[PDB]
Design a protein around this ligand. Structure first.
Ligand code: ZN
Lengths: 411, 116, 330, 124, 225
RNA sequence: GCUUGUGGCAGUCAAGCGGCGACAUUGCUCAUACCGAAGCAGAAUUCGGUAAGCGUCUACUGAUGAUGUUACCGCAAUAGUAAUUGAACUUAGUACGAGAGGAACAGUUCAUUCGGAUAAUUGGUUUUUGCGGCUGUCUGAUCA
C-alpha cells in the first residue's frame, strides 16, 4: 500500500448522514401520487424509492470501507503506528459496525420490498415504506458514536507523514529534544519546532535528502524518556531499515548529565543492535566507553549549529547504509559568460522581449532581426531564375534566332 | 510557391489545384487534373498519349532541349541575396520569355515540310 | 429547426435593407458607413499566416475568398430623421435635380411605355438661388439628428442587362451634423469610391438574399464578421498582382465568371462566402461596432490569387502564359 | 480537420517493425458523438492485433494511425491520398514499441507525435 | 554547462531543435520561450535562427548537419532555404537530398568529422553527405537499430547510444568514431537518446525528466569541462 | 387549503394542557457554472444553496385577396431567437510541498456538436443525350 491515505472520503456525522440520504431520495424520486393510481404503479413507485434509499446508505458504507485501510494488513510498522494512534479494537469495531449496518440495511430492503410488492392499498404501501426507511434511520441513529470516532481518525490518519519503511531512512533518537530537533532542519528543507522544551515534538517527521544520486529521508523521533506517544518511536526504531543516530550533549545544550543518557542507552541496547548505530554528542570519556563496548557504534563530539559537523556524521551514515581531428570550440564560447540570473546588463532573451511587446502569446515572433547579408538596404524583399550568373550566360543566347528567321520551313 | 510541373503532363499545378499520390516509394507523383489521375490508374503510357508534352517532345512534335531550357535547373545551393540580383534577374526573366517566345515563333510550321 | 429564422417565408425583396448601422462617432471625420455591390463569383488565395501562437504560424494557408463587384456610387439625395416617442421619422428628402436615367427607371415598371415624365417640377425648383432647396435642407440641419444619404449603384457600369439602378439609404456618422449635411451638399451628383469607405484588413459584414431552390431559399441573411483582404482599383492595371510576385495580372479569371461578366471597376476581396448567388446585390456594413481581436487586427501579406477559368479544370492564369501550350491557325 | 477514412471495425496493415502483421480497430480514443466517428490520420484508436505475436489474442492496446488512404483536404493546399492505410503500436504516453517505422507517415501525425516522427524514416 | 529545459512541456529536445558547434537551429510554433533556453546559454557564441522544415516542428528529426553546413530533406521549401542561407554565416552549405528517406535526423547521424548513415541509403548520396559536410561516412546500425540518428547522439568529445547497445556494441562502434561511448537513457528512461537531447563540444541540453545520474553521465562522457 | 424525509410493539421523564402530553428517551427489528463551510498545504473531493441550465373540424405552412392612382425610400407596434462541449501554448513544474505530486487569474491557438450561408474544391451524381472506342443491325459500299 502507498504511504499516503489522504484520499479517504469524509465520514459525515450520523445526524448529517441521515438527512443527506433521506433528502437525496426525496429530490431524486417522484413525489406526486394519488389513491386512484394503479396498484402496480404505486408499488413500483414506492419500490424504487425504497431501493434507492437503501443504495444511498450502502454507497456511503461501501465507500467508507474502501477508503479506510485494514489496520493489520498495511504493514507491521504502520500496523502499530495506526494502533498506537487509533486503538485497534475501536478501529476494528467501527469498521465491523459499518459492515453490520450495511448488512442490516440489505435485510431491510429484502424484507419490506417483498412485502411492499404484494400490497393492495396505498396506505399499506405508504405505511410499509415508512417502516422500511424507519429501521434504516434507527440503525444509523444508534451508530452515531462509532461514526464520530471514524471522522476524527479520518481527518488525522490522512495527515500522517508518508514515511517509507522500505527505502533508506535515517532515524534520530536521544534525550528529548537535546539538539536533535534542530538537526533535521539543517540536513534538508524541513521545519520542526526549535523551542527547547522537553517534548518539543509529539509525532514523527521526515526530511528528504540525496547523496550519491540516491534518495535518503531523515526521521526524527517524538522523544524517549510507558508513554503512548513514546511507543510510536519504539516501533519506528525496530521496523524501519535505518542506522539510528543517538544524540547527547557535553558542554552547551541542556547541561544534562551524560550518566543518565548512558544508562538510558543500555535500556535500548538489546533492541536496536541490528541497525549499526552511531552516537553524536554536542571520567566523561569513561562513561561513553560503556556505550563504546558495542563495536558498531562511535562517539562524535560535534557542534549542532554548523554544517561542517552535520555532514561529518551524515557522510559516515550514508556509507554505513550502503555498506550492507580535434573538437571545435569558437573563441566566442569562452569569451562570453554564464547566464546571470539578475544582472541588469545580462544578455536579454526573447523570453523577456516578449513581455515588452505586451505578453508572450501576443508577441509575433519575427524571423528577421537575425539576418546576415552584404547590406540589407530593403530588409523586406518561376522563381528558380533568381540564381546569379544567369545574366552573364545571356551572351550565348541572343544570336539564336539569326539562323532560323531567314530559312523556309518555320521561316 | 514555385509550383511543381505535373509528371504526367508537364503542366504546372498552381496552389489549391491538382491531386498528389504518396507511395511506399513515394517519389511524390502529382496529377494536374482528374483525367491524369484516372488515366494513370488505367496504365496509359505518356509516350502514347497524343495530348501530353511527353509524347510531343518524344515524337518530335516540338523541340526537346534549348539553351534557355537547360537552365530550368531547380538549384538547391542558395547564396546570400541582394536587391540588385533580384532586380537583374527580373530582366533575365523578360529575356528568357523573349528568347523562349522567339523559339516559340517557328516549329509549329517547320513540321509543314512536305506539305508546302 | 432554428426558431431564430422561422417562419421561413419569402424575403421582402431581391434587395436587402440594412436594419442597423454603426451606433455613432461625434468626433471622427464624416464618412460613409455602407456600400453596395454584386456577387462576382469566388476565387482562391494563398497567404502566409502571421498569427502568433497558431499551429500554422508563418505557414502558407489556402482559403476561399469571395469577390464583390463594387462600382463607384453616386449620391442622388439625402434623408433627415428626427427622434420621436414612436420611433425615428423621416422629416424631409431632397434630390440632386439631375437623377440619372437609371434612377428614373427605378420609379417606373413599364418604362418604355411611360412618357418618362420623371422629376420635373422639383427639377424646376433649381431655377433660382436655391431658396426652396436650401430651406428644406436648412430645417434638416436645424431639426434632424441622424442623416442618411440616398445613393444608387452605377448599374450601367456593370455587365448586367438590368440598367435599373438599385436605390437605398446609407447612414452617415460624425459630429456637428451641420458638417454632415454640408458633406452631402458637396457630393450632390458626385461619385464615391470604396477606397474612401473601406480599407485592407478591416472587418465588415455583408447582407443579401440566399439562393433559391424553386419552401426553401429566398431569405435575407446578415452573416457577420467578414474580413476584407484587398480593395483593388479595378479600373487600374495589375489589380490581381502581389508585392512578392510583381507580375501583371487581372483578378478576372480567364473566360470571366460563371453567369457573370468581366470586372472593370472597383472591387473588394472578402473572406468566406457572402450569402447570395451570382448576380445578387449585396450591401456592406462595417462590423456594427469596434470589434477588437487578434484575428481582426492581423494583417494579410497577400501572396497569390487564383484567376483560372472555372468552366472546367484550369491550367494557366492568363492567355499570355498559355503560349506554353496549331493546325487550325498555322 | 481532415476527411475521415477509417470507420470503426476496419482492418489494415502495420507500418512499424514490431512484427505485427495486421491491426484491427474497435474504437477511437476520445470518440465524438452525433453514425460513429470514423478514425483519421494521426488519431489514437483502440486496436487489437489479428495475426502476428500469438500472445496478442483479443488484446486491445492504443494505436496511432500513420496512413489513411482516403483523399483529404490539407492546409497546404494540395489534395492527396496514400497508397494504403496503416498504424503503429505505442503506449498512451507515445512510447513507440517498434524502434523503427517505415512507409508513408502523415506530416500532421509526425508533428502531432514527436516520438513517432523520431521513429519514422519515410515521413511525408 | 549541461542545461535542463523543455519545449511546449516536452522532454524531446532534439525533435524541435538542431545545434552544432557553429550555429543553432530552433523550431517555431505555438510556444516561444524555447528560443530563450539556448540564447541564455549561448548568447552571441553562435547564431540562433527560427526556422521550419517543410512547415513542420520536427526540424531536428527531419534535418542533419555539422559545423561546416546543413543537410535538409527533399521537401524543404525554397523560402526556408533562402531564409536559412541569408540568416547563417557564409561557411554553411545547404542542399536537398533526392532519396526515399526523408527523416534525416532519424535516418542519418553526423558529427564534425564522422557520419553514420542507413545501410540501405543509395551510394550516390553517400558522396554528397561527405562533400557537403566534409566528414567520413560509414554504414552502421547501433546494436542493430536502423534509425541511428534517433537512438544515437555523437560529437567530437564523445557520443551516446540507447541502452540496448551492450559493451561489445559500444566498443566496436568506438573503433569507427575513435571516441568514448556510453549506453544508457535520457529524460528518465527515454530510449530515444538522440531526440531526447542535443549536445555539442561545449553545450548540452536535456529534457526536464532527465535524472541526476543521467545528467552527470552525459556531462562526464561528453567532457563538458 | 389530497401529495414527499424520518417504523411497529412495549417503558421512564416531562414544556406544558388540565387526569392527558411534543422532541429528546430505553429494549429487537449528481458530469456544467457561481457562492458559504470542510486538517480544503497543492491536485482531486464531499456537504449546503442558486440557474433547473445540462446529460449519461382544427394546429402548422405555401399562395391570392375602401387605406384618391401608382412607384421609390423609410420607422416599428408586435411574434420568434442560439449557440454549446472539449482540447494545446504561456502564465508551471512557479505558488503550494519533507517528498511523491502539483494549481488559479489574465493573454493567445485549436477541435466536436448545433444552426445560416457558399459550390471556390471533394465527392454519391451524367438527358455535356460532348468527345474517342466497341457489339449486332445497315446500304451492294468507301459514306451511317
Ligand atoms: Zn497531368
Amino acid at each position: 500500500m502507498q504511504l499516503s491515505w489522504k484520499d479517504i472520503p469524509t465520514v459525515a456525522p450520523a445526524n448529517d448522514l441521515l438527512d443527506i440520504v433521506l433528502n437525496r431520495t426525496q429530490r431524486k424520486t417522484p413525489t406526486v401520487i394519488r389513491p386512484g393510481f394503479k396498484i402496480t404503479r404505486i408499488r413500483a413507485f414506492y419500490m424504487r424509492k425504497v431501493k434507492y434509499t437503501g443504495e444511498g446508505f450502502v454507497e456511503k458504507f461501501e465507500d467508507i470501507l474502501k477508503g479506510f485501510p485494514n489496520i493489520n494488513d498495511v504493514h507491521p510498522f504502520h500496523r502499530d503506528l495506526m494502533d498506537t494512534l487509533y486503538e485497534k479494537n475501536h478501529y476494528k469495531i467501527s469498521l465491523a459496525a459499518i459492515s453490520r449496518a450495511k448488512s442490516l440495511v440489505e435485510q431491510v430492503a429484502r424484507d419490506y420490498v417483498r412485502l411492499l410488492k404484494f400490497g393492495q392499498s396505498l396506505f399499506q404501501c405508504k405505511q410499509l415504506k415508512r417502516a422500511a426507511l424507519g429501521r434504516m434511520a434507527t440503525i444509523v441513529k444508534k451508530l452515531r458514536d462509532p461514526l464520530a470516532y471514524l471522522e476524527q481518525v479520518r481527518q488525522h490518519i490522512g495527515r500522517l507523514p508518508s514515511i517509507d519503511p522500505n527505502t533508506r531512512t535515517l532515524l534520530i533518537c536521544g534525550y528529548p529534544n537535546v539538539g536533535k530537533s534542530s538537526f533535521l532542519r539543517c540536513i534538508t528543507k524541513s521545519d520542526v519546532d526549535v523551542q527547547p522544551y522537553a517534548f518539543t515534538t509529539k509525532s514523527l517527521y521526515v526530511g528528504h535528502f540525496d547523496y550519491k544520486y540516491l534518495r535518503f529521508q531523515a526521521i526524527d523521533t517524538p522523544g524517549i524518556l510507558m508513554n503512548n506517544i513514546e511507543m510510536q518511536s519504539i516501533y519506528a526504531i525496530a521496523h524501519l531499515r535505518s542506522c539510528v543516530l543517538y544524540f547527547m550533549d557535553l558542554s552547551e545544550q541542556c547541561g544534562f548529565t551524560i550518566e543518565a543518557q548512558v544508562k538510558l542507552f543500555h535500556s535500548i541496547k538489546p533492541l536496536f543492535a541490528n541497525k549499526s548505530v552511531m552516537v553524536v554528542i554536542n571520567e566523561r570519556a569513561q562513561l561513553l566507553e560503556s556505550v563504546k563496548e558495542v563495536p558498531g557504534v562511535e562517539i562524535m563530539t560535534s557542534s549542532c549549529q554548523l554544517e561542517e559537523n552535520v555532514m561529518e556524521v551524515r557522510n559516515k551514515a550514508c556509507e554505513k547504509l550502503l555498506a550492507s581531428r580535434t573538437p571545435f570550440i569558437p573563441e566566442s564560447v569562452k569569451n562570453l559568460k554564464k547566464y546571470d540570473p539578475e544582472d541588469p546588463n545580462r544578455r536579454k532573451l526573447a523570453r523577456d522581449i516578449e513581455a515588452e511587446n505586451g505578453g508572450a502569446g501576443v508577441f509575433n515572433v519575427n524571423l528577421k532581426d537575425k539576418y546576415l547579408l552584404e547590406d540589407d538596404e530593403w530588409k523586406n524583399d518561376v522563381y528558380d531564375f533568381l540564381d546569379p550568373e544567369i545574366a552573364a550566360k545571356l551572351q550565348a543566347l541572343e544570336e539564336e534566332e539569326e539562323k532560323l528567321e531567314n530559312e523556309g520551313f518555320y521561316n | 510557391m514555385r509550383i511543381y510541373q505535373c509528371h504526367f503532363c508537364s503542366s504546372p499545378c498552381y496552389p489549391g489545384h491538382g491531386i498528389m499520390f504518396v507511395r511506399n516509394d513515394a517519389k511524390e507523383f502529382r496529377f494536374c487534373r482528374s483525367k491524369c489521375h484516372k488515366a494513370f490508374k488505367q496504365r496509359r503510357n505518356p509516350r502514347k498519349l497524343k495530348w501530353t508534352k511527353a509524347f510531343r517532345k518524344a515524337a518530335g512534335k516540338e523541340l526537346a532541349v534549348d539553351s534557355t531550357l537547360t537552365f530550368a535547373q531547380r538549384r538547391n545551393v542558395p547564396v546570400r541575396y541582394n536587391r540588385e540580383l533580384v532586380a537583374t534577374t527580373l530582366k533575365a526573366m523578360a529575356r528568357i520569355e523573349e528568347i523562349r517566345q522567339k523559339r516559340e515563333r517557328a516549329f509549329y510550321k517547320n513540321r509543314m515540310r512536305g506539305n508546302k | 429547426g432554428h426558431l431564430g429564422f422561422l417562419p421561413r417565408k419569402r424575403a421582402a425583396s431581391i434587395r436587402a435593407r440594412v436594419k442597423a448601422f454603426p451606433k455613432d462617432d461625434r468626433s471622427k471625420p464624416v464618412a460613409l458607413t455602407s456600400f453596395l455591390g454584386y456577387k462576382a463569383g469566388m476565387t482562391t488565395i494563398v497567404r502566409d499566416l502571421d498569427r502568433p501562437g497558431s499551429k500554422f504560424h508563418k505557414r502558407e494557408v489556402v482559403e476561399a475568398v469571395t469577390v464583390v463587384d463594387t462600382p463607384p456610387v453616386v449620391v442622388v439625395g439625402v434623408v433627415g430623421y428626427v427622434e420621436t416617442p414612436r420611433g425615428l421619422r423621416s422629416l424631409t428628402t431632397v434630390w440632386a435635380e439631375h437623377l440619372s436615367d437609371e434612377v428614373k427607371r427605378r420609379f417606373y415598371k413599364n418604362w418604355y411605355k411611360s412618357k418618362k415624365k420623371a422629376f420635373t417640377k422639383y427639377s424646376a425648383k433649381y431655377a433660382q438661388d436655391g431658396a426652396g432647396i436650401e430651406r428644406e435642407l436648412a430645417r434638416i440641419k436645424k431639426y434632424a439628428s441622424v442623416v442618411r444619404v440616398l445613393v444608387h449603384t452605377q448599374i450601367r457600369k456593370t455587365p448586367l442587362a438590368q440598367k435599373k439602378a438599385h436605390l437605398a439609404e446609407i447612414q452617415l456618422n460624425g459630429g456637428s451634423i451641420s458638417e454632415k449635411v454640408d458633406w452631402a451638399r458637396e457630393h450632390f451628383e458626385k461619385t464615391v469610391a470604396v477606397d474612401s469607405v473601406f480599407e485592407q484588413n478591416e472587418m465588415i459584414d455583408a447582407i443579401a438574399v440566399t439562393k433559391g431552390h424553386g419552401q426553401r431559399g429566398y431569405h435575407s441573411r446578415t452573416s457577420i464578421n467578414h474580413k476584407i483582404y484587398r480593395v483593388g482599383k479595378g479600373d487600374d492595371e495589375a489589380n490581381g498582382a502581389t508585392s512578392f510576385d510583381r507580375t501583371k495580372k487581372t483578378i478576372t479569371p480567364m473566360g470571366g465568371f460563371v453567369h457573370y461578366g468581366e470586372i472593370k471597376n472597383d472591387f473588394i476581396m472578402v473572406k468566406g462566402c457572402i450569402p447570395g448567388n451570382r448576380k445578387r446585390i449585396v450591401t456592406l456594413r462595417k462590423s456594427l461596432y469596434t470589434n477588437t481581436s487578434r484575428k481582426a487586427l492581423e494583417e494579410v501579406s497577400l501572396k497569390w490569387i487564383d484567376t483560372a477559368s472555372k468552366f472546367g479544370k484550369g491550367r494557366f492564369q492568363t492567355p499570355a502564359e498559355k503560349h506554353a501550350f496549331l493546325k487550325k491557325d498555322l | 480537420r481532415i476527411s475521415l477514412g477509417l470507420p470503426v471495425g476496419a482492418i489494415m496493415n502495420c507500418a512499424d517493425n514490431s512484427g505485427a502483421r495486421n491491426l484491427y480497430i474497435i474504437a477511437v480514443k476520445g470518440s465524438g458523438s452525433r453514425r460513429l466517428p470514423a478514425a483519421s490520420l494521426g488519431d489514437m484508436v483502440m486496436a487489437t492485433v489479428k495475426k502476428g505475436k500469438p500472445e496478442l489474442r483479443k488484446k486491445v492496446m492504443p494505436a496511432i494511425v500513420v496512413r489513411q488512404a482516403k483523399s483529404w483536404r490539407r492546409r497546404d493546399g494540395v489534395f492527396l491520398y496514400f497508397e494504403d492505410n496503416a498504424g503503429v503500436i505505442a503506449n498512451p504516453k507515445g512510447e513507440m514499441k517498434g524502434s523503427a517505422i517505415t512507409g508513408p507517415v502523415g506530416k500532421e501525425c509526425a508533428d502531432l507525435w514527436p516520438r513517432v516522427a523520431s521513429n519514422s524514416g519515410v515521413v511525408v | 554547462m549541461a542545461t535542463r529545459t523543455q519545449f511546449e512541456n516536452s522532454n524531446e529536445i532534439g525533435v524541435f531543435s538542431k545545434l552544432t558547434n557553429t550555429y543553432c537551429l530552433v523550431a517555431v510554433g505555438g510556444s516561444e520561450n524555447f528560443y530563450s533556453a539556448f540564447e541564455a546559454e549561448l548568447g552571441d557564441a553562435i547564431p540562433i535562427v527560427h526556422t521550419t522544415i517543410a512547415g513542420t516542428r520536427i526540424i531536428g528529426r527531419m534535418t542533419a548537419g555539422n559545423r561546416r553546413g546543413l543537410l535538409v530533406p527533399t521537401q524543404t521549401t525554397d523560402q526556408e532555404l533562402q531564409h536559412l542561407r541569408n540568416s547563417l554565416p557564409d561557411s554553411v552549405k545547404i542542399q536537398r537530398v533526392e532519396e526515399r528517406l526523408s527523416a534525416l535526423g532519424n535516418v542519418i547521424c553526423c558529427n564534425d568529422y564522422v557520419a553514420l548513415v542507413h545501410p540501405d541509403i543509395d551510394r550516390e548520396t553517400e558522396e554528397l553527405i561527405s562533400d557537403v559536410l566534409g566528414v567520413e561516412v560509414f554504414r552502421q546500425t547501433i546494436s542493430g537499430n536502423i534509425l541511428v540518428g534517433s537512438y544515437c547522439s555523437l560529437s567530437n568529445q564523445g557520443g551516446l547510444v540507447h541502452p540496448q547497445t551492450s559493451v561489445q556494441d559500444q566498443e566496436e562502434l568506438s573503433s569507427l568514431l575513435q571516441v568514448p561511448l556510453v549506453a544508457g537513457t535520457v529524460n528518465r528512461g527515454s530510449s530515444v537518446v538522440g531526440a531526447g537531447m542535443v549536445v555539442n563540444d561545449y553545450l548540452a541540453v536535456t529534457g526536464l525528466d532527465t535524472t541526476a545520474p543521467e545528467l552527470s553521465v552525459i556531462e562526464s562522457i561528453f567532457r563538458l569541462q
